[PDB]
Amino acid sequence: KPAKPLPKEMEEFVQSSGENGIVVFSLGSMISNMSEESANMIASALAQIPQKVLWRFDGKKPNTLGSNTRLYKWLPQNDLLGHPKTKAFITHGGTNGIYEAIYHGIPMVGIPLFADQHDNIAHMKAKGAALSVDIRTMSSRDLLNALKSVINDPIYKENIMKLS
Amino acid sequence: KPAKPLPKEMEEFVQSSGENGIVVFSLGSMISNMSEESANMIASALAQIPQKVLWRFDGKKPNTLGSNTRLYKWLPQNDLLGHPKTKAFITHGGTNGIYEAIYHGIPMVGIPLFADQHDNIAHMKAKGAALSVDIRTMSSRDLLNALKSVINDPIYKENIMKLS
């Protein structure tokens, strides 16, 4: 699972998303162990989307961050995934978050690094419950496009929700 | 964060630790990308402790797994850390996990692999809020000695509850 309310200041930010709703990037645990320009290429993508973004982040502030995007050292990932404004989930593709993504039926953009992460996202994509990015090159536009598909094209939400 | 209750099945288990209480190993997101013997070493340290242990895990069941230790592909880490029966948190030391442990008063053993994790754990260690393992060599007994100290010496708790 059941989802509990969010902290006030965070609820306030989610509610400011009107009918566009929210994107959650959690955990982004391996972003700090990548180049400043990767975080940038991503922040560039997140910025150009009408959704508010809550991005689970600890390192240096990306200098492409949007006014849509807020960086938090800790997020209630699960509480957010259960929010009625959540449209998409961004994750490395650790099994834990994909279980919560499935539970609450929130379709995903994967950004894997290690085989574990690649094969988990490959699986959800084969089930049309996610799109994936990077490994092979990546442009902001590649992520941006991935993000507008899953958010706006309702088939990805049908597909994740046939898994729960 | 607040902690909502666990799933009934996970509550039966947690309650089966009586006056020993529980250890949470979550997420251990990188356990999948290290050798089988690594898991078998850790499992051998977890088995040697009267606590029940919930380990967030998604590969090949370790063959030195204890009867006290159960593997789960997903955990409600935050609800577990909340639970009044929790004694110790084992984590790679990512920022997110150290935030819930601070919030809830749960001392930690870090098993860090990256710099952000090596730093976060070194801070916690110096606050007297955690011990740390691996990097340099690593034997089961190092992880056991660490565990018993944090579970049993009430100082490590006292220190983490000054941080919250």
Q: Convert B86-148 into a string of H (helix), E (strand) and C (coil).
A: EEEEEECCCHHHHHHHHHHCCCEEECCCCHHHHHHHHHHHHCCCEEECCCCCCCHHHHHHHHH
CA nearest to B93 within chain A: A29
CB neighbours of residue B149 within 10 Å: 15
- Measure CB to CB from residue A73 to each of B2, B56, B99 and give the nearest one: B99
Spatial distance between the Cα atoms of A117 and A91, rounded to a whole number of angstroms: 9
Contacts of A130 (CB under 8 A, 6+ apart): A107, A108, A109, A110, A121, A124, A150, A156, A160
What Cα–Cα distance (Å) separates residue A45 from each residue in A23, A29, A57?
12, 19, 16
- Which is it for the CA torsion B135, B94, A151, A163, positive or negative? positive
CB neighbours of residue B152 within 10 Å: 12
Q: Which of B86, B92, B87 is nearest to B132 (CA)?
A: B92
Contacts of B74 (CB under 8 A, 6+ apart): A95, A96, A99, A100, B56
A82 to chain B: which residues are within 8 Å by CB? none
Spatial distance between the Cα atoms of A128 and A150, rounded to a whole number of angstroms: 10
Element (H, E) at A38: helix A36-47
- Which is it for the CA torsion A65, A68, A72, A76, positive or negative? negative
Experimentally determined by = X-ray
CB neighbours of residue A122 within 10 Å: 15
Bridge-based pairing of strands A86-91 and A130-132 is: unpaired
For residue A79, give how far its alpha carbon lies from the nearest alpha carbon of chain B (Å): 10
Q: Which of A40, A139, A156, A32 is nearest to A88 (CA)?
A: A156
- Test B74 with A100 for CB contact under 8 angstroms: yes
For residue B12, give how far its alpha carbon lies from the nearest alpha carbon of chain A (Å): 16
- Measure CB to CB from residue B116 to each of A27, A59, A114 and give the nearest one: A59
Spatial distance between the Cα atoms of A119 and B98, rounded to a whole number of angstroms: 28
- Which is it for the CA torsion B141, B142, B148, B151, positive or negative? negative
- Test B114 with A33 for CB contact under 8 angstroms: yes
Spatial distance between the Cα atoms of A108 and B47, rounded to a whole number of angstroms: 37
- Test B95 with A74 for CB contact under 8 angstroms: yes
Spatial distance between the Cα atoms of A47 and A25, rounded to a whole number of angstroms: 13
For residue B80, give how far its alpha carbon lies from the nearest alpha carbon of chain A (Å): 13
Spatial distance between the Cα atoms of B136 and A138, rounded to a whole number of angstroms: 35
Element (H, E) at A39: helix A36-47
> Rounded to an integer, what is the distance from CA A109 to the centroid of its chain?
6
Enumerate long-range contacts of B79-82, CB under 8 Å, 24 or more apart.
Answer: B79/B3, B79/B4, B79/B5, B79/B6, B80/B6, B80/B14, B80/B22, B80/B24, B80/B26, B80/B54, B81/B3, B81/B24, B81/B106, B82/B2, B82/B3
**Residue A3 corresponds to which tokens in the numbers above?**
């989802």
Angle at A89 between CA A81 and CA A116, to 5 degrees: 115
- Test A75 with B58 for CB contact under 8 angstroms: no
For residue B25, give how far its alpha carbon lies from the nearest alpha carbon of chain A (Å): 13
The experimental resolution of this structure, in angstroms, equals: 2.5
CB neighbours of residue A36 within 10 Å: 12
- Test B99 with A56 for CB contact under 8 angstroms: no
The answer to whether B159 and B127 are in contact (CB under 8 A) is yes
Helices A95-104/A115-126 angle, 10° precision? 20
Helices B95-104/B115-126 angle, 10° precision? 20
What number of CA atoms fall less than 13 Å from residue B87's CA on the CB side?
23
- Which is it for the CA torsion B14, B17, B23, B28, positive or negative? negative
Q: Which residues of A70-81 are buried (b: 16+ CB within 10 A; e: fewer)?
A: bbbebbbbbbbb
Bridge-based pairing of strands B22-25 and B52-56 is: parallel
> Rounded to an integer, what is the distance from CA A11 to the centroid of its chain?
17
Contacts of B142 (CB under 8 A, 6+ apart): B45, B133
Spatial distance between the Cα atoms of B89 and B20, rounded to a whole number of angstroms: 14
